[PDB]
Amino acid sequence: VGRLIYTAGGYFRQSLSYLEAYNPSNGSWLRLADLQVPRSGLAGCVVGGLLYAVGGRNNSPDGNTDSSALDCYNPMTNQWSPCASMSVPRNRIGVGVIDGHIYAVGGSHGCIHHSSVERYEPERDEWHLVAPMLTRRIGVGVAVLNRLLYAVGGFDGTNRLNSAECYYPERNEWRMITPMNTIRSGAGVCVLHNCIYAAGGYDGQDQLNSVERYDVETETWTFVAPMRHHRSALGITVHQGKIYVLGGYDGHTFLDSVECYDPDSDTWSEVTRMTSGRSGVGVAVTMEPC
Known part of the structure; x- marks a missing residue:
């Protein structure tokens, strides 16, 4: 949590340069400075109050x-500034932050599906x-809980994946975890309480509305209530103890629907709609602008 839910980029007919921010406290949306380059399949994150847009296409x-870019948006100035680029372009990337360092995971570059991972130091740029x-993954969901980074699902070039793995920084090592009950590429992955949630995605045949969560202590995946809408390539974030999913594609429409999950009641509700339907956005939470 920080203040507004920011959605950057995305896709509808072509990649988008929109940066818009939603305020759950009052229902409003603000259109902010466009990205320098339109991109879909990117990930967003926040470090030190600044918003970062990473990868995409x-x-x-x-x-x-395909993009190897890292760009930073400062809400205090309503401006984007380029940062050092990644070693390689990464579309349909997953990103997580551990103790102020940005980890860029997987993604594609043309027909190449990466297993590589890199870490960004903001002060040193x-x-x-x-x-x-251990696995090549594009459309991979990533989230960080207790300073451990999880990469969930995705597509390896041949098969969509129900597998997942965790990175232990002090040993610079990855280990497989219990696989999900469902194959998912393009799922929204986030952390809430002591679990990693995987919502939606595509299982090889259908966009999904199911949601399951991995308890890092018991190592089990359990389904929770499904979203109202089936969606793949959705944006996701957590704000004030609730999960918000934004957009995506349901096999028919590029969704403008934003749903919110309340873990206390185990229910999803429709809370606002984006200004236009789109998929493949980057999302993160930080202070309101200007």
Whole structure:
């Protein structure tokens, strides 16, 4: 939590440059400075109050260019500034933050599906590669709980995945965890309480409305209430103890629906709608602008 839910980029017909922020306290949306380059399949995160947009791909009428970019948005100035780029382009990337360091995980570059992982140091403005995952994964969901980073699901070039793994920084090592009950690429992955949640995604045949959570202590995956809408390539974030899912694709429409999950009642409700339907957005939470 911090204040507003920011959604950056996305896709509808082509990649988008929108940056818009939703205030759950009053229902309003603000349109803010556009990204320098349109991108879908990116991930967002926040460190030190600043919003970062990482990776993705610019699908435009004249080209599909995978991105190795890291760009930072300062709400105090309503401006984007480039940062050092990653070692390699990464579309349909997963990102997590551990103690102020940004981990960029997996993703694709053309037909290459990465298992590589790299870590960004904001004050030093540098990226360095760390140990790669045990599995190549694009459309991978990533979240951090208790300073351990989890990469969940995705697609390896051949099969969509129900597997997941965890990175232990002090040993720079990855280990498989219990796999999910359901194959999911493009799921929204986040952390709430002591669990890693995987909502939606695509199982090889259908966009999903199911949601399951991994208890890091018991090592089990348990389904919770399903979302009202089936969605793959959705954005997700947690704010004030509730999960918010934004957009995605349901096999028919690029959704403008934003649903919110309340873990106390185990229910999802429709809470607002984005200004236009889109999938493949980056999402994160930070202070309101200006």
